[PDB]
Amino acid sequence: VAVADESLTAFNDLKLGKKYKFILFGLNDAKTEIVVKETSTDPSYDAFLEKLPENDCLYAIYDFEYEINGNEGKRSKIVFFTWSPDTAPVRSKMVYASSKDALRRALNGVSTDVQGTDFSEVSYDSVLERVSRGA
């Protein structure tokens, strides 16, 4: 499949202008291109978690900002998620496993990747632990 130019524009605006806090990508009904499905400027991580579908897959980009120790400000890292819940259809899980690289090879500046199979692998403390260390 191909990456819709709009998906690349939405990424450049998050990356270079912090225009969005997170973006959700998915396949078009035709299942031929990867488009944006939802964008948001909500800083609450909970708000992002609430949009993750329990029975379907998606891809997402999150602008993860965390406190950098030493009485120094913050750091921000772009995290790429593959949301693929055990409760999702096998054909969906697979088509999304397939199309992942199309969208992933195209994004430049992603610091860390997360493969969410459930809400524990995508929890705040869990993302923060991966992002903090040698990511």
Q: Give me the domains of the chain, ranges plus CATH numbers.
A: 1-135 (3.40.20.10)
How far apart, in whole angstroms, are the C-alpha atoms of residue 77 and residue 134? 12
Residue with tokens 């054909």: 91
Structure tokens at 10: 């939405």
Report the distance separating Cα 12 and Cα 9, nearest Å. Answer: 5
Dist CA 82 CA 112 (whole Å): 12
Residues 6+ apart with CB under 8 A from 68: 74, 75
Which amino acid, residue 59? Y
Centre a 10 Å sphere on the Cβ of residue 34 and count the other Cβ atoms it contains.
25
Please list, in sequence order, all residues whose beta carbon lies within 8 angstroms of the beta carbon of residue 124, skipping any fewer than 6 positions away: 45
Using the 8-state DSSP alphabet, how is residue 123 labeled? Answer: S
Expt. technique: X-ray
